[PDB]
């Protein structure tokens, strides 16, 4: 019963699965700012470290990658899925850094950050373990979904 | 620690806090479908039971309450916060059923929901414990935030 497992499941059910389904079944028939894409990819970007504010790391990564704000109209949620994306030739490259990981940080930040300001090596190990388990569960869920296996990737670099 | 704790923290950081901040500091100067409200409330609706699809229960509850889709404009996220709401006199009543709980359900289904089809009383016990811990952690986070303490409530009835 790891919390990163539940976080990965919630992230997959509430975003990754719907985004992959939109890429596979709706994007080829949807015009995004004038263009019609035949191929799309969703890239999951992990934070370099689980810092105090994952939203700021996400904003910085999106601006440094030259992404623009777009949205996908889905039928499995009452409101569209907001994303950041860019064009690479004929491919629509969507990126996302999972903001749901925020809680994870605070959880670790409430168990190890004691009697000191920085991050002990034990906090770093527990953080890396939670990160790796999140990535493993997310990859297992992606592999069991045809659309996700088709168009979703977890980014490698740190 | 407990996955319900991390789920509550992520739900508070990614929605409840921002919605309360919008209600307190941005709603009195924003037109919601033509009207400008001076008082607003956010009501958190827990599912009666943690069923297979929390999005369907949420849609059903929203239709049974006569709610309509609106959106809040926030400066802490690159895209607006989508909500369901209604008008009660001069008060804007916002409702939300936390879809993030979905993962929790599935997690429980991988430790007890075996060798049977339904939900045993022991699995139901663990599910109720996770739900109660989620509600308690969320309430503790609400009480430590002035805006949330001002305008956020967890619904009573089952
Ligand atoms: N780029 C992008 N990512 C998405 C989107 N929808 C979900 N995600 C990601 O998937 C995670 C789980 O979403 P959730 O299950 O609906 O669980 C959500 C959801 O219950 C609530 N929440 C967040 N934003 C909203 C909102 O705008 N409206 C409502 N009614 N609830 C929200 O807080 C919980 C946590 O949200 P997050 O921490 O950000 O964590 C979210 C987020 O990282 C999207 O449209 N665009």
Residue numbers in the entry:
A (entry chain A), B (entry chain B): 157 to 314
Task: Pull text from the paper.
During phage infection, bacterial STING sense c-di-GMP generated by the CD-NTase (cGAS/DncV-like nucleotidyltransferase) encoded in the same operon and signal suicide commitment as a defense strategy that restricts phage propagation. The structure of MySTING was then solved by MR using the refined model of PcSTING. Both PcSTING and MySTING crystals contained two nearly identical protomers with root-mean-square deviations (RMSDs) of 0.29 Å and 0.64 Å for 158 and 160 matched Cα pairs in the asymmetric unit, forming canonical V-shaped dimers of STING domain. Here, our structures demonstrate that the symmetric recognition of single c-di-GMP by dimeric bacterial STING proteins is dictated by the guanidinium group of arginine residue (R233/R230 in PcSTING/MySTING) that recognizes the O6 and N7 atoms of guanine base, the backbone oxygen and amide group (H238/H235 in PcSTING/MySTING) that form three hydrogen bonds to the Watson-Crick edge of guanine base and the aspartate residue (D252/D251 in PcSTING/MySTING) that binds to the N2 atom of guanine base.
